[PDB]
DNA sequence: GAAGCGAGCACGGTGTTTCGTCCTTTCCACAAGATATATAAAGCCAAGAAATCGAAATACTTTCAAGTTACGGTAAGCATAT
């Protein structure tokens, strides 16, 4: 069965209280009856910290950097700036150069 | 003239070849092997065609990568009001 959005807030609450070391212990002690990697894969989800924020500058050195050096005509491959920046996801990440 | 000095030819050898069996075949022959045929019940071997199932190819599903429409909220410098 799927959540009933009433778990991740004790998950998130468990990890930040044992530090995100051993999901293994903090789904046990949550009793969801299932694997970590079942109720990982929501929470990180959820989370919010795997987004970016506004822009600095100096990014944008790196942003141009990585597009003089492998960009491709009018297509650019976020893909590649996903792999090598990290915290900026793909479908935001296409407005930097839109 | 018969005793002292140089004398043929029958004879006695190997070695080489010839000749003439005994050899095992090729070939042939008289007596007798299935060789045709009649079953017949049994189960198994074994060389051809027809139905069935495994593999997979090209096809369509389906799912996963890209991304640009449409959309909702804040921040700066020029214009304008008493």
């Known amino acids: 069965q799927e959540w ?15 530090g995100h070391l051993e999901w293994q212990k903090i789904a046990e002690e949550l009793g969801t009856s299932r694997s970590a990697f079942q109720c990982l894969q929501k ?5 919010k910290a795997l987004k970016r924020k506004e822009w600095t500058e100096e ?19 976020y893909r590649r700036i996903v792999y090598y920046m990290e915290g900026r ?10």
């Open 4 to 18: 009933s959005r009433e778990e991740e807030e004790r998950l998130q609450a468990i990890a930040a209280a044992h």
């Open 43 to 47: 929470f990180q989800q959820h989370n």
């Open 59 to 77: 990014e944008d050195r790196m942003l141009t950097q990585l597009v003089q050096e492998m960009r491709v005509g009018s297509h650019i491959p």
């Open 89 to 98: 996801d793909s479908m935001q990440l296409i407005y930097r150069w839109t």
